[PDB]
């Protein structure tokens, strides 16, 4: 049994998730910078709307490290609907077999947290 | 996708304390925010940066009665010993690479302030305006609380409603309200009645000022 | 003390262009990132644009991209916003703001006073000014009638008279024009010794009126 290591991102508009270049990989203290690369995969639930007609809810997006999860066979950057690639500077373009996916029986999801940059590069950058 | 949610309003009693809430959208529960205060008819003022671990850093000149805290995706501004000056819209601000985001703002109202009766001054049309073939009566109303009044005009003893322009009361530097009412007349109207009156009613009580040609 | 002073607001026809400026003092201008922020009447704050220390980098809210630019003159301590293809929803107060010098964050630590931008077909109209002659203390004033847009500044005796002055908020008339009054409370014994002049400035129309107010 398999799951994203992280909780989902809720998309609030109509547009797909977008991330600044070099951002989008969830924070994870005990992670190597070689590993900071993967994809978000969209999931959409449907329920009845206020008019009784089936409708889509806000899509949720789940992160998977590169080479793991439902699209473990996709190479980084491959175009596919419902898939958003993200990578941090210095990440290695290699499958993250050792990280794999989360077994929900043994671990709860890690709260997905993104980095917070400055509006423009400043300070040392 | 980076969104700050604030409730539109809040209220608490004078001298009491209030807690305002800003909520970060999903995936940003680790972000720091800043709180800004915008007093009525004023630009904003930086209050405080609040971090996700609950710590906060006041700006210079911000009183100790303002503090900040945090829990999960929620960021709080706590104001104790509430004073009249604390009525304002409060905005949370956050930031990220390439972006700058504000909440919708929370309007804070501070209940139980002391009643204060209006001061009323009524001016007749100037000689110069009449010589330009116009006539304006100027009714000036200050120093009242709460900030709701009723203004009624009279020609002699008859109520007049046409040609009246009255402002919405707004808070002044001394934390009481001011308002204005203007009555437009022809010079002949002005000269042909015995007097004109401005009646200001506030929290029950009415006063009336009167001017004559 | 850090100060930010915005200028250049006024009336602009839709589709036209307008440049705002912000004069900074009290700190080393070239050491700080500077932002523009706006507020439509009765709505919230909305970020507009950001410019780096030396003007080499910039970014824009999606709502103004391709229409507004931001620029900076460090020698003259001034920040600008060039606005073009203006639409009615650009109307509002525009604020200059200083980003903290903190290396790791981008909160604003200082705000300007704001300048009003009015995107409309209505024409600019300067006020007519009439004295409100006085009847311990007497109240005397100036009526500032029929102008557009806000704001008007009133001073008294070119600024030397300040104690006792109350300038009231303007009324918006059904004609679409504004009027306001300014009153100053003085000692009765001063009437006849002291000259009282109110100085009215309506920048959007370059109207500058001084009206003497004498007892009746
Ligand atoms: Zn959410």
Author numbering:
A (entry chain A): 48 to 172
B (entry chain L): 1 to 213
C (entry chain H): 1 to 135, 142 to 222
Authors' own words:
The SARS-CoV-2 N protein is a highly immunopathogenic viral protein that elicits high titers of binding antibodies in humoral immune responses. In this work, we report a human mAb (nCoV396) derived from the COVID-19 convalescent patient that specifically targets the SARS-CoV-2 N protein.
To investigate the molecular interaction mechanism of the mAb nCoV396 with the N protein, we next solved the complex structure of the SARS-CoV-2 N-NTD with the nCoV396Fab at 2.1 Å resolution by X-ray crystallography. The interacting CDRs pinch the CT tail of the SARS-CoV-2 N-NTD (residues ranging from 159 to 172), with extensive binding contacts and a buried surface area of 1079 Å2. Light chain L-CDR1 and L-CDR3 of nCoV396Fab interact with residues ranging from 159 to 163 of N-NTD via numerous hydrophilic and hydrophobic contacts. Notably, the SARS-CoV-2 N-NTD residue Q163 is recognized by the L-CDR3 residue T95 via a hydrogen bond and simultaneously stacks with the L-CDR3 residue W96 and the L-CDR1 residue Y31. In addition, a network of interactions from the heavy chain H-CDR2 and H-CDR3 of nCoV396Fab to residues 165-172 of N-NTD suggests that the conserved residue K169 of SARS-CoV-2 N-NTD has a critical role in nCoV396 antibody binding. K169 is recognized via hydrogen bonds with the E99 δ-carboxyl group and the T100, D102, S105 main-chain carbonyl groups inside the H-CDR3 of nCoV396Fab. In addition, SARS-CoV-2 N-NTD L167 also interacts with I33, V50, N57, and A59 of H-CDR1 and H-CDR2 of nCoV396Fab through hydrophobic interactions. The superimposition results suggest that the CT tail of SARS-CoV-2 N-NTD unfolds from the basic palm region upon nCoV396Fab binding, which likely contributes to the allosteric regulation of the normal full-length N protein function. Additionally, nCoV396Fab binding results in a 7.4-Å movement of the β-finger region outward from the RNA binding pocket, which may enlarge the RNA binding pocket of the N protein.
